[PDB]
Here is the input.
Amino acid sequence: SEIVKFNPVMASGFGAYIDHRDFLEAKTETIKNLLMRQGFVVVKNLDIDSDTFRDIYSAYGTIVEDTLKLEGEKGKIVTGRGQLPFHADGGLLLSQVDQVFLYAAEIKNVKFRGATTVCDHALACQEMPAHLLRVLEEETFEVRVLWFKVPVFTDLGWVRKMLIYFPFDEGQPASWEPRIVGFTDHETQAFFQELGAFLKQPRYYYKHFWEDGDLLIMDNRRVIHEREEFNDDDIVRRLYRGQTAD
Amino acid sequence: SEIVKFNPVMASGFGAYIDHRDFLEAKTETIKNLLMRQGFVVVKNLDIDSDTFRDIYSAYGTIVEDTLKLEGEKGKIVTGRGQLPFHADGGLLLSQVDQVFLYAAEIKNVKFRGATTVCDHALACQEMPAHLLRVLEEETFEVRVLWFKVPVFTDLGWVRKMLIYFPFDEGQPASWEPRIVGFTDHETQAFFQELGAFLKQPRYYYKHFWEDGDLLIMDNRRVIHEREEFNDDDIVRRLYRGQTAD
Amino acid sequence: SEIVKFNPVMASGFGAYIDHRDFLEAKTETIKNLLMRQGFVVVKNLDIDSDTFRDIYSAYGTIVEYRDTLKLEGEKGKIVTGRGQLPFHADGGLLLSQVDQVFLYAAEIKNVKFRGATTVCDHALACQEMPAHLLRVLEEETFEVRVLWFKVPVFTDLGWVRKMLIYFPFDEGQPASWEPRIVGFTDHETQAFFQELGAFLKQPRYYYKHFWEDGDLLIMDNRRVIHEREEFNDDDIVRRLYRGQTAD
Amino acid sequence: SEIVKFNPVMASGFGAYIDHRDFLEAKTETIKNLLMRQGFVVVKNLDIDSDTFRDIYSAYGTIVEYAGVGFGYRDTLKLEGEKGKIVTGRGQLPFHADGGLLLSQVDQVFLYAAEIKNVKFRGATTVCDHALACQEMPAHLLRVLEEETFEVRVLGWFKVPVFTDLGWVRKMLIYFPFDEGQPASWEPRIVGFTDHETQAFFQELGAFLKQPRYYYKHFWEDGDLLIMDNRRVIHEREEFNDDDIVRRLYRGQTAD
Amino acid sequence: SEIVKFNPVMASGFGAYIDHRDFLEAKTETIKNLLMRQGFVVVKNLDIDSDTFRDIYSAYGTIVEYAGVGFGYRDTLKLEGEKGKIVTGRGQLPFHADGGLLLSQVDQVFLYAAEIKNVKFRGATTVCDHALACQEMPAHLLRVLEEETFEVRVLGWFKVPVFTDLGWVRKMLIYFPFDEGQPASWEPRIVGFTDHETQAFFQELGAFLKQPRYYYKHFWEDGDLLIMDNRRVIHEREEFNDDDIVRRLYRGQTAD
Amino acid sequence: SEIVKFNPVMASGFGAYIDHRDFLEAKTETIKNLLMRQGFVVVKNLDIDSDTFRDIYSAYGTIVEYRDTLKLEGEKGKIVTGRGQLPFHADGGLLLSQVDQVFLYAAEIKNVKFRGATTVCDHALACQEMPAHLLRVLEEETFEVRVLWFKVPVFTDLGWVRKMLIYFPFDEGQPASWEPRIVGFTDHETQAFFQELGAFLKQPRYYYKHFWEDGDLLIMDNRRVIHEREEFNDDDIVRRLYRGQTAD
Ligand SMILES: CC(=O)N1CCC[C@H]1C(=O)O
Ligand SMILES: CC(=O)N1CCC[C@H]1C(=O)O
Ligand SMILES: CC(=O)N1CCC[C@H]1C(=O)O
Ligand SMILES: CC(=O)N1CCC[C@H]1C(=O)O
Ligand SMILES: O=C(O)CCC(=O)C(=O)O
Ligand SMILES: O=C(O)CCC(=O)C(=O)O
Ligand SMILES: O=C(O)CCC(=O)C(=O)O
Ligand SMILES: O=C(O)CCC(=O)C(=O)O
Ligand SMILES: O=C(O)CCC(=O)C(=O)O
Ligand SMILES: O=C(O)CCC(=O)C(=O)O
Ligand SMILES: [Fe+3]
Ligand SMILES: [Fe+3]
Ligand SMILES: [Fe+3]
Ligand SMILES: [Fe+3]
Ligand SMILES: [Fe+3]
Ligand SMILES: [Fe+3]
Here is the structure.
C-alpha cells in the first residue's frame, strides 16, 4: 500500500495538489485510491502529448467512449466556448463514469475566464439547509437533451454519488434542460439559483484556471463539476478529456 | 437506492442513531451502505434472541468464524472482564473483518463501566499533530499474542483501513502486546499514551454504555474500537458478537 | 418538570423538531418551556381540525384576539390574509397587544413546493454576532411604523432575551400593510440599512425556511424570534393556515 | 429599556465585565436582566462598606437569609476564612448552586471582597456556563444528568433535582464531592451507581465543566464584586489553606 | 513596556476601540506599537481642535506632506466634501492604501471628525484586514495578487507592487476601480488580463474583502478619531453624494 | 521583494515547511522576513557541514556569541549542552544579549525517535486566546530568574509582536541551569501557575514538536516564539546539534 505526497487544495482538507515528479513516480492505484477521498487531483507542469495522456488515463479502468478534444469550437456546446453548468459525467448518455481526466494542451490569452470548477458535494449536502437537501433527496429530477429521470443520489456506501444537471445561465447555448416534477418553472429556477449559490461557496468550491501542462483528475462519484464561459475569440483553450470506469 | 432515517451521534456528523422500527424496516444494503460513511450504527430497544441476531448480521456478508458470547468470564481475556484496548477486528488472526455487530443480551448492575467505545480514525488522522501521524505512516508496527507485522494503514481508497493493537493498561490481563521497530520501550509507551489521549478526545470518540436490547454495528475499516474494564463481580454483561466480510 | 425528546433544527442547536406522538403526549408547559430557549417548534404529520388546534394553543395562556383563530387562506385583495410577502416582524406591535406564542397549522396545501414559506430568524444569536454598525442602529436609533407614525421599540429587555419588535419594509411589488421609517435617516439610508440587515438575518446560521405540508404545526416564541412569510402569488396555489396567538 | 455598557468575559460571549461607574449609575433592573443571559457580572474597584453592599444587593429581590425561623437579620454572610468551618472555612467548596427549592431558592448571589492579602493564585471563586456545557457535552455525560437520581447528605439521603426547567434555562442544582483532604459539609451519590462509578462520573464531568470555554476563575482583589445568576451558572470555591492568607468576602442572596 | 486598555473591534481580535481618556494618557509609542498588530484604532468623544490634532499625529513620525517641492506646510488635509473634487470630494474612494514607496511612503493615517451632520448611513470610512484576508482567500484570487503585474494611471501607466514584504506584514498597495457613476482620479489594469477579466477579478476580490470577518465600517460622528496602520490595512471611503450632508474630516499622515 | 514557496506547519497557518532546494535558492532576507510572521522554518534533507551552516546563519545579522557556533552534543554533567530538559524559554535573557534568530542544525542523530525533541510555541496566538487569569499574571506581575535574582520582563512591545522573555521551571529530576520566581507569589502558587500555563502553551493549536533527523534545519524567530528541549537521557542516543544565533 503505497503513499503519494500531496497537499490539500481546500481549507477543509479536500483536494490534492501533487507535484509532477511525484505524480509520475506513483503507481496508478495510489492516485486512484487518493481520488476517492480527495475528490480531485491537480498536477501542474506536466509535459505530455496526447498518446502519453491516453497511457496515463487508460490504466485507471475501462475507457468510456477515446480522447475528446475540447478546443472551443464556435457553433458547438460541449466542445464549444460557453458555460457547461454543474454536472457529473455520464448520466445523460447512461454510461458509468468513475474518473474524468482533463489535460491542458494549449492555453493562450485567458487568465480569469474558462475555469473548470469542482464541487465537494458530500460536504455540501451534509452542511446545507434542510430545505435544499429535502428537494434533492425526495423529489424527482428529469432532464431532456438539446424527458427522462436522473437519480440525484446513488448510494455507493462510501459516498452518495451525485448525478444532477443544472440549467444553463441565460445567454449560454444549452446542451440540456432540467425539470423537477411537481415544481413550477418559477420554483425550479429559484431552487437551482439558491442551491447553485450554496455549492459555489469557497468551502466546497474550487476554480481551476488553466495553464499549459495542467492535469485535472476528478472522481466523478465524489464531485460534480462545471466549465465557466470563455466567449472571447482571442482565447485558445484546448483540453484533452479521458474517462474511465470499472 | 433506499434511505434510512437517522440522527448523527457525533457533533461532526459521524455515527448513526437509528430507531429500532426504522432499522428493522430497512434493507440490509441500506444499513451496510450507511456504515461505510458513518462508521457506526446504534440501535436501542430491539428485542431479539440469538437466532434472530444471527439472521440480521449474516445478511451483511460471509460470516467470519459463529456467534461469540462475550459474557464476562473470570479467567479469560477477550471473553473476560477487563479492558480490551484500541483495536480493529481481524488482523491478529489474519481474517478480513468488514462489519462487527454487538448485541446486549443482558446488562445488570453497570452504569458507568464496561463501555464499548468507538474512534473516528479517519478524522483523527486528518487532524492529529504531524509527529503522531508520521510514526503511524512510516514506522513498522509489530504485535505478539499472549512477533509479526500488522500494517497500520491499508488503502481502500474511500478510507485508509486501520489495523493497530494498543498496549493494555497496567493491571489489565493482556491478550496482546505491541512493539514499534527502532523504538525503545520508553518511546513506544510514550507514543501510545499520547496517541491514545488524542484519539479519546470527544470530537472523535464515542462511549457506549450498554443496556438490554442495544445493537452496536461497526464498520471495521472506518473505525477502531475498545472495551473499558468491568472488573466488579456484581456486573452482568452479556454481549453477542457477529462478524462479516465480503 | 418533564422532558420532550427533540432534535435541533439549526446547526447552532436552535429550533426543535418534535415527533407528533411526542408532541401530543407532552404537557403544554414542557413545550412552552422548550420554546423560550429554542425559539421555534416544528411538528410534522399531525391530523387535527380547528377545534383541536384551538384546544392545543389556548392552554399556553390568554388568547390574543384579532375572534380567536385567524384563517390565513390567501384571499385576493388582502394583505396579512393575502397572497404576498409579509416581511420580517414579530406579532402584536401594530395593535398594542402582547403576543408571547404564535401557532401556525397547515390545514391544506396544494401545488406549492418552493414558495409561500414561513421563515424564522434567531435574532438573539444574530444580534450577538452582527457587525457593530448594524447593531448600533437597532440599539440607539428611533424606529417608527405607519399602518397602511408611531414609535416601536426595537428591544425590550426581558432578561432572558431582548425581545425584538421590528417591521421590515415590503419588497417593491408586494402590497404593503405597513411602512417603516428611522428618525434622522433619509429614504436612501433606511432602505440601505434594511436591505443589508435583511441579508444578515437571512444567513443560514440564523434562518430557517419552513415549506408547508398538510398537517405541519409551527409554533414560535414571539419574544425569541422574528418571522416572515414569503410570497405565493400563483393562483394555482392552495395555502390555508390556521393561526393562534397567546400571551401571559 | 435601559442598556449598560459591558465587555464579555468568555470568548463565547458569556459573562459581563462592567466598569464600576457604569455599574453604580445603572438601574438594578438593568443588571438583573443582564445577569439572566450573561450568567455573571464582574466589577472591579468598588470601594463600598457592608451597609452599602447590603443596599446594592437587597434591591434585586427578597433577601434570602443564610442557614427557630427567620426575621430578616441573617442577610450578609461573612466568609472570612474561619478555621474549623466549611462554608465560612478555608477549604474547597466544590461545584454547586446556592439555596434549594421553593421558598429557599436563590436567584442571585453576590460576593464582595472586603479584604484580600497574600493571595495571588489560590482561593478563586470559579464560575461555570452550565447551559452551554450541557448543550456541548458527550451524550453519555448528559444522559446521567438528565435521567438518574442524584442524592446528597449533609456531613439522611435526599433527592436533589439536577434540572429544573424555567424555560429560559434549565436551573441546575448539583453538589459535587469535595476533593480528598478537603473538609466536607456534603456528600453526593447517584442511585444505582456504585462508588467507583459515581467517583468516575464526577471526575469526568468536572473536567468537562472546567474547560476554558465554559469556566471562569476569579482571583480576588479588594473592591471586586462578583454577581451570579444562580439559575444560570454553578460555582465553586478553590482552597486557600495557607495561614498567611487574609480572604474576607461578604455574601448576599436574593430571590423573586 | 507600557500597555493601553482596549477592546477588539473585530470578532477575530483585530482592531482596537480605545476610550478617549486612556488614549490621551497613553504614550505615542504605545499606540504606534498597538496599531502594527491591530491595524486600526477607534477613539470616540475626543474634543480637540486642528492644532491639537496636529500635535497628536506629528509625534508618530515624520509628517508626510499631501499632494515645486515641500517645506512642511502641507500637513493637515481637510477633506470637507468639496464639490468638483475627488479625494476631497463627495464620491467613493475605493480600496487603496495611502502614499507610495520610498520617501513618499505612509506608515500611519489619521482621520479626525471635525463636523458631521445629516448623515447616518453613508460616507463611511471602511477598513480591511488584508493579511488575514490573503491568508484565507481562495488560492485563485491570491495567485493573481502575488504573480501578476498591476498597473494604475491617474485620470501614463505605472506599476504598483501589490505586496512589499516587511516581514511582519506584506504591506499592500492596490488601487481598486471606482464604481460606475463615481468620479475617478484613478484607473487600474492588470497586465495580460482583458477588461472583462480585470473587472471580474476586482468585483470578486472586493466581495471577499468586504466580508465582516475582515471588514469594518466606520460611520462618522463629531469627535471620532480613526488611526490606521497603512502597512497593515487597506481602506475605502463610501460615497456621500447628498447635498444636505456636512462631512468634514482632518487628515494626517506619518512615516518612519 | 521575493517569495519562497512554503507550506504551513500549524493548522492555524503558523510555521513554514520549506523544501531544501527552495531554501538554498532563496535570499536570506526572504527567509528572515518569512520568520517574523511565521515564527519558525523547518527544512529537511539538507547536507551541509558547520562552515556552510555558519555562512547561512551569519548573513541574517550580527553573530551573538556564547565563540560563534555552539555544539549541543549531549555532554554528560552539563546543562544546556547536556542531556536533559530545557523548559520553555527564549534565548538571550540570562546574559543581556539580544537574540533575534536562533538556528538549529542536525549533524548526527542516532537511536532516537520519540525523545529529545525541540519544541516550538506560538506565544502570540496563545496569549490572545488564553484564559484572562493566566494572561493577567504574565502582563502585570514581576517575574525574576536566578542563574544556577534579577527581573526579566515578560513582554517587550515591539509593535508587530510582544516579544516574550520567560524562563519556565525545570521538571523534578531534570538538572536546572536556572530557577524562576514570581514576586508576591508563594512557592505553591508559582509552581501551580507554571504547570497550568505550560499545559495551555502545549496545546496542539500553539505547539509543534520537532523530532530530529540528519540534515534537519530548524530556524526560530526568537521574538515571535518560545521554545523548549525535551529530555534525551538514554545513553544509546546520539544527538549532535549545531547552534547559531543572530541579532540586529
Ligand atoms: C462526458 C459526459 O458525461 N458529459 C459531457 C458533458 C455533460 C456530460 C453528459 O452526459 O452530457
Ligand atoms: C475478533 C477480533 O478480531 N478480535 C477479538 C478482539 C481483538 C481481535 C483479534 O484479532 O484478536
Ligand atoms: C448558600 C447556599 O445555599 N449554600 C452555601 C454553600 C453551599 C450551599 C448549600 O450548602 O446549600
Ligand atoms: C494620501 C494618499 O496617498 N492618497 C490620497 C487618496 C488615495 C491616495 C493616493 O491617491 O495616492
Ligand atoms: O472543458 C471543460 O473545462 C470541462 C468540459 C467537461 O466538463 C466535459 O467534457 O465533461
Ligand atoms: O465486549 C466488548 O464490549 C467488545 C469486545 C470486542 O471488541 C471483540 O470481541 O472484538
Ligand atoms: O406565514 C404566515 O402566513 C403567517 C405569517 C404571519 O406572521 C401572520 O399572519 O401574522
Ligand atoms: O467563598 C467563596 O468563594 C464563595 C462561597 C460560596 O459559594 C457559598 O457560600 O455558597
Ligand atoms: O474621507 C475619507 O473617509 C478618507 C479619505 C482617504 O482615504 C484619503 O484621502 O486617502
Ligand atoms: O534543542 C536544543 O538542544 C536547543 C535548545 C536551546 O534552546 C539552546 O541551546 O539554547
Ligand atoms: Fe463534464
Ligand atoms: Fe473487537
Ligand atoms: Fe406574524
Ligand atoms: Fe455557593
Ligand atoms: Fe486613503
Ligand atoms: Fe534556547
